[PDB]
């Protein structure tokens, strides 16, 4: 069973997600659909091609035509971001599943709020320094973070992680972590992260000087 990897539309709009199979699975057998929100188990939206389980709103609909099946979602809203899976039975009447489709809500552009965190004295005593740059509540996902230490561009010693679209406002957040040894951290003064994003007229920089802060 093949599904498109992703679909997207604005709040209030409709999307369709299609599921291509063969005469041996979708062709002969019933199709179900599942919603999988981040970190949760699949939840059935549709069974027997077009039936809704109790508690599933009629914003969700299913249909089946030949060796294909379709899930429709109308009135898109900020809790609909999830992976959507088609499911049916194969020739042996064993369960098979599509590869899943990630739904993105196309909301309005939002600029990130940027925060920087020096390493804790507590960590420094452990011999390492993690410097963290937080980019909070932005849209769309595309963002660039650039680290500089005493004006030296850092390349290769940072890692970033991005949340899924927020269940409340459909934004993303991103955290970038710069890793240095304690010895290296204590050799430099100025630590800065520079953020570029659609919502910003120009790049935003947050910085600190080593020595300005002490643990509580």
């Amino acid at each position: 069973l093949t599904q498109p990897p992703s679909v997207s539309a604005a709040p209030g709009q409709k999307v369709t997600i299609s599921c291509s199979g063969s005469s041996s699975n979708i062709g002969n057998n019933y199709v179900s659909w599942y919603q999988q929100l981040p970190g949760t188990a699949p939840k059935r939206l549709i069974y027997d091609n077009n039936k809704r389980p109790s508690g599933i709103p009629d914003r969700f609909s299913g249909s089946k035509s030949g060796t294909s099946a379709t899930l429709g979602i109308t009135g898109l809203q900020t809790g609909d971001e999830a992976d959507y899976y088609c499911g049916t039975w194969d020739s042996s009447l064993n369960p098979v599943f599509g590869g899943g489709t990630k739904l993105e809500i196309k909301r309005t552009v939002a600029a990130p709020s940027v925060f920087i965190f020096p390493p804790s004295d507590e960590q420094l005593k452990s011999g390492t320094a993690s410097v963290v740059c937080l980019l909070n509540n932005f849209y769309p996902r595309e963002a660039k973070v650039q680290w500089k230490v005493d004006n030296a561009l850092q390349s290769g010693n940072s890692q970033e992680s991005v949340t899924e679209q927020d269940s409340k406002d459909s934004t993303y957040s991103l955290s970038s972590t710069l890793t240095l040894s304690k010895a290296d951290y204590e050799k430099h003064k100025v630590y800065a992260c520079e953020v570029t994003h659609q919502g910003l007229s120009s790049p935003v920089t947050k910085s600190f000087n080593r020595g300005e802060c002490i643990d509580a």
């Binding site: 188990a41 064993n94 369960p95 098979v96 599943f97 709020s113 993690s130 992680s161 802060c213 509580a216």
Partner: protein, 216 residues
């Protein structure tokens, strides 16, 4: 009716993966089927096997020689044994089962991550990310395997919380950060505690995050 997977989150290569699904609120001998489905990180769903009302079992042909599914009536549980595991068996494993009627929603367990690796368990170190809006958080560093769970103020604080996907460091250990944005005016009066649990190492920590003394 409630399904709950239990078993080790770390298994060494060539050894046997054992999981159990405890079923609450419904008899195990009254199920249409009980079964297992897995989902490798970032990927889709793969059926492993099922056991039917009579005790008859059906397995995924690509896994058949390695899979055993059985039921314990007295404990009202069913199990999965997957022998000779390799890194390719790393996945979130879900137990599932159908009750009451043919058209009823099957219930799912929470899913349990099983990592197949020759690396050993390691508990995390927890470091504070100390602070009209202020951001604060915790850095949960150098643990193995996934996952860790993070909450704030024992679940009382959920608004504005972002817990990022873990990043695999070049060291082969994971790190994760969790942040929350709060009113700046609350920093002097409200206590913020990040609650961290890493079940594979039996490590639980409650870390108070206190504002730094910072003169910039």
């Amino acid at each position: 009716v409630q399904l709950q997977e239990s078993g080790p989150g770390l298994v060494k290569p060539s050894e046997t993966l054992s999981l159990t699904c405890a079923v609450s609120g419904y008899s195990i001998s009254s199920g249409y089927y009980w079964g297992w489905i897995r989902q490798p990180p970032g990927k889709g769903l793969e059926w492993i096997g099922s056991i039917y009302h009579s005790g008859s079992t059906y397995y995924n042909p690509s896994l058949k020689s390695r899979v055993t599914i059985s039921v314990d009536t007295s404990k009202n549980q069913f199990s999965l044994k997957l022998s000779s595991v390799t890194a390719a068996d790393t996945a979130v494993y879900y137990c599932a089962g159908l009750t009451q009627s043919s058209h009823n929603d099957a219930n799912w367990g929470q899913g349990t991550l099983v990592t197949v690796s020759s690396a050993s368990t390691k508990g995390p170190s927890v470091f504070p990310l100390a602070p009209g809006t202020a951001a604060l958080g915790c850095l949960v560093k150098d643990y193995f395997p996934e996952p860790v769970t993070v909450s704030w103020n024992s679940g009382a604080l959920t608004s504005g919380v972002h817990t990022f996907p873990a990043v695999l460091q070049s060291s082969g250990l994971y790190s994760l950060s969790s942040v929350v944005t709060v009113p700046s005016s609350s920093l002097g009066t409200q206590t913020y505690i990040c609650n961290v649990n890493h079940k594979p190492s039996n490590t639980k920590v409650d870390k108070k995050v206190e504002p730094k003394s910072c003169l910039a």
